[PDB]
Every structure is written in structure tokens, then in C-alpha cells.
Amino acid sequence: GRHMIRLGYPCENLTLGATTNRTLRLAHLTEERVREKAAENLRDLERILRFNADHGFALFRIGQHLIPFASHPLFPYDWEGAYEEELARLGALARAFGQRLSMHPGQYVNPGSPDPEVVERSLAELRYSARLLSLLGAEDGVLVLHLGGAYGEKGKALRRFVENLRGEEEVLRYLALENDERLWNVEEVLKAAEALGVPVVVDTLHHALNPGRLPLEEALRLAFPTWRGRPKVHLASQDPKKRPGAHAFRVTREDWERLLSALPGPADVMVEAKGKEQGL
């Protein structure tokens, strides 16, 4: 039914066996083989949107590998010219379904790195991700990123992060920043986000493990105003007895109820669980 809290899951759908994350070995990165993997990923994206419209999921995170190696210097064709018509069509479908699309580049995308080549590769991956959202016409699309490593000194790390992203107009249209379980708490991310003029994604599990001085309610109250559109929040539960921050197969009733009770208002909740669409 119709709830003020909308739900999503990331990358793939276990029920369908549909995924947006097919890739290949660099040795196999021919135009032919890449076009084949991309076509499968795009076919599965469509399957997922349609599944989501029937099963009440309004959010979906598209895998980084949708177009495998798109941002790699050896990518063999103009993927934007190849796919712009198809992405416009899929994006129109997603909007017609009232679905919100996002992307979450991985741990290796580090704009605050002091290594120029890591920065360049990271920005390339962000530009690909932002362009994809643009091609899909994802109005309120989200491109979620952690602040990355502290590289020995947090103040200089955050300075490089901001300085290396400030001129990235298209990336900043979608970018939102997320707290983590070790390095950057909600209060720290709010400061970074304010500097770049972007929203803050609160991750409930990361917050529980690294709360700083804030209860969940106050974290969410502070993060809410950073969004022009509906806030996005991440909900996960701890995979019992694994590394802190590892995601359980299914979110617990207790974590879901804690979030529901703490939310200051309507929001979009990305369920991060190994069970994907079965994760809540």
C-alpha cells in the first residue's frame, strides 16, 4: 500500500535472479562482450523496475557495473551514444512508476586521496555514475558516497575531498554523503555536506556503531533539512558476530521499528541487506 516511508533495495533481485552488476575480466573487454553484458544488465534493470512497481518498492540502486568498465581508460566505445535512447526510455518508465534511482560507488572511489591517479580514477567513476543518472532523467536521483580514508590526517583528507569535488557540477546535482562505522560520524558528514552544498544520507547501522554525541533521532533531525526532495536513509542490521557494519540477510523488526519511531517525517529508506528485496 501507500506509506509516507518508501522502500528500496540495491543492485539485484534475488527472486528474479536479475542483476545490474554483471562484469568481465579486463582481458575480455571487447566491444562485443561488453555490449552483451550491458544488454543483460539493462534488460534486468527493466525487469526490476517492473517487479518493484508490482511489489511496492519505490527505490532502486543501480549496480556500478550496469555498463561494465564504463569509466576505465580501455572502455571500447561511446557508451553514452550507444545507450542514451534506451536509458531515456527506462528512465521514463521509472518515473511513470514513481521510482527513485540511485547509485553508490564503492570503497575504492576516493576523491580525498592524496594520490593524483586515485583521484582521477575516482572522479571518472563519479562522472560516469552522474551521467547515467542524467541519461535516465532521474529527477531526484542520488549518488551516495562515503568520505573515504582518513589518510593519516582527517582535516586534510576532508579538505582534499571537498576541493576535488567542488567543480564537479553534474556530480553535485546528485551527490549525497553517508556516515560510516569507523571514520566519519553524522556530525562530521554534515560539515562536509554543508561545504559542498549536498545532502546527508544517515545509515542507521553505521550510526549505531559510530554515533558521536547524537541519538538516532537527532541525527535524522539534522540530516532532514539537507535534502530538497525526500530524504534518503539507509537501514541495515548487523550480521550477527561478523565484522562491525556487515549487513545481515534481513533487517530485524527492532531496527525497523527504531527507525520508524525516530523518523521526523516522510523519507525514502534504502534497505541494505543480503536478502535484497527480501531484506525487510
The smaller minimum CB distance to Mn ion, of residues 19 and 102, is found at: 102
125 near 105, Cβ under 8 Å?
yes
User: Least CB distance from residue 146 to Mn ion, whole Å?
Assistant: 5
Give the per-residue contact string, 184-223, with Mn ion (x = CB under 5 A; - = no).
-------------------x--------------------
DSSP 38-76: HHHHHHHHHHHHHHHHHHT--EEEPPTTSSTTTTSTT--
User: Is 203 annotated as a binding-site member?
Assistant: yes
Of the residues 57, 234, 267, 273, which one makes contact with Mn ion according to CB under 5 A: 234
The DSSP 8-state label assigned to residue 248 in this structure reads P
CA dihedral 235, 237, 243, 249 (to 10 degrees): -100
Q: How many residues bind Mn ion (CB under 5 A)?
A: 3
The smaller minimum CB distance to Mn ion, of residues 203 and 268, is found at: 203
Give the per-residue contact string, 171-190, with Mn ion (x = CB under 5 A; - = no).
-------x------------
User: Is 206 annotated as a binding-site member?
Assistant: yes
The smaller minimum CB distance to Mn ion, of residues 203 and 255, is found at: 203
Signed CA dihedral, 265, 266, 270, 271: sign only: positive
Annotated binding-site residue numbers for Mn(2+): 104, 146, 178, 203, 206, 234, 247, 272
Q: Which residues are annotated as a binding site?
A: 104, 146, 178, 203, 206, 234, 247, 272
Binding site for Mn ion (CB under 5 A): 178, 203, 234
